[PDB]
């Protein structure tokens, strides 16, 4: 019987949305589905800022950022545990971490 009252992710009044390509396995899943996570980081990561700010010219300067929006299919997100299985009731909560 029906598992989620959203079925997959949210459509409710459309009927078709273009698919997107999974970022890990390269699957096809409708963009309405497909767990998406914003990925922002510094170019210099963690320990390098020391040796980066010392070797660098300029006073200060600043750290640029890498901005990437990841799309997973249901298979990869579960396997990469970008998400995990919750209890019958806990599944209902759409609220973030």
């Amino acid at each position: 019987p029906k598992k989620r009252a959203s079925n997959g992710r949210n459509k409710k009044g459309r009927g078709h949305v273009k698919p997107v390509r999974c970022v890990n396995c390269s699957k096809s899943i409708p963009k309405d589905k497909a767990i998406k996570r914003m990925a922002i980081r510094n170019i210099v990561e963690a320990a390098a800022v020391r040796d980066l700010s010392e070797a660098s010219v300029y006073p200060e300067y600043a750290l640029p950022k890498t901005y990437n929006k990841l799309h997973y299919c249901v298979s990869c997100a579960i396997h990469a545990r970008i998400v995990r299985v919750r209890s019958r009731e806990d599944r209902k909560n759409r609220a973030p971490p």
Binding site: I43, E60, Y61, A62, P64, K65, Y67
Partner: protein, 216 residues
């Protein structure tokens, strides 16, 4: 087996006078030989420098300028404005959810004959007391905002030469002029001319190039 790096010479790259710091750096080309001029492999080169390096301020931190060298003389190479782009990091940061992204572009020739495509970008903003979470524009807003931005692009570029446009961009007179026209319509946070592409170039004319370079 030659370790060719003792072959080549060194030339000092010169920026246009429309900028502040006019010594960009250096570069190497092989030594001029019979049936190879080092000016040949020198000419078509294009250099991308940050406008922070050019103007010296960090308010220009993103905004890269392409600089193409037309001619070389006596270890110096004179470069002209080849275009401007926005440094993807800066571009990505300004794109955010819960807002309308508006883009516009126009292609227009300048007074000196230069065919240019210039791009603009803006975003809607919540304002003051606004309790709704998104602040998207209506379609009718964006149509009229794009019409206004392009009106200004064609106007500001039409009367001007390649240097006036350059001289206009550094202060960002266009951004401010855009915000003025647009606020009757919709709040419109940020705003920029984010790119300018060289499409057609006139015939050589060292005269205009020496007037830009040289005297100072």
């Amino acid at each position: 087996v030659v370790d060719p790096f003792t072959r080549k010479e060194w030339f000092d790259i010169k920026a246009p006078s429309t900028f502040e710091n006019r010594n960009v750096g250096k570069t190497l080309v092989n030594k001029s030989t019979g049936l190879k001029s080092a000016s040949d492999a020198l000419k078509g080169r294009v250099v991308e420098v940050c406008l922070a390096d050019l103007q010296g301020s960090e308010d220009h931190s993103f905004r890269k300028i392409k600089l193409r060298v037309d001619e070389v003389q006596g270890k110096n190479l004179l470069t002209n404005f080849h275009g401007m782009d926005f440094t993807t990091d800066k571009l990505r940061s300004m794109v955010r959810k819960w807002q309308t992204l508006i883009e516009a572009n126009v292609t227009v020739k300048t007074s000196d004959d230069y065919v240019l495509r210039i791009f603009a970008i803006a975003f809607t903003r919540k304002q003051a007391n606004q309790v709704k979470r998104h602040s998207y524009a209506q379609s009718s807003h964006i149509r009229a905002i794009r019409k206004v931005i392009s009106e200004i692009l064609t106007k500001e570029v039409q009367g001007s030469t390649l240097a006036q446009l350059t001289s206009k961009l550094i202060p960002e007179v266009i951004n401010k002029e855009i915000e003025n026209a647009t606020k009757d319509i919709f709040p419109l946070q940020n705003i920029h001319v984010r790119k300018v592409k060289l499409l057609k170039q006139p015939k050589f004319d060292v005269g205009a190039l020496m007037a830009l370079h040289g005297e100072g």
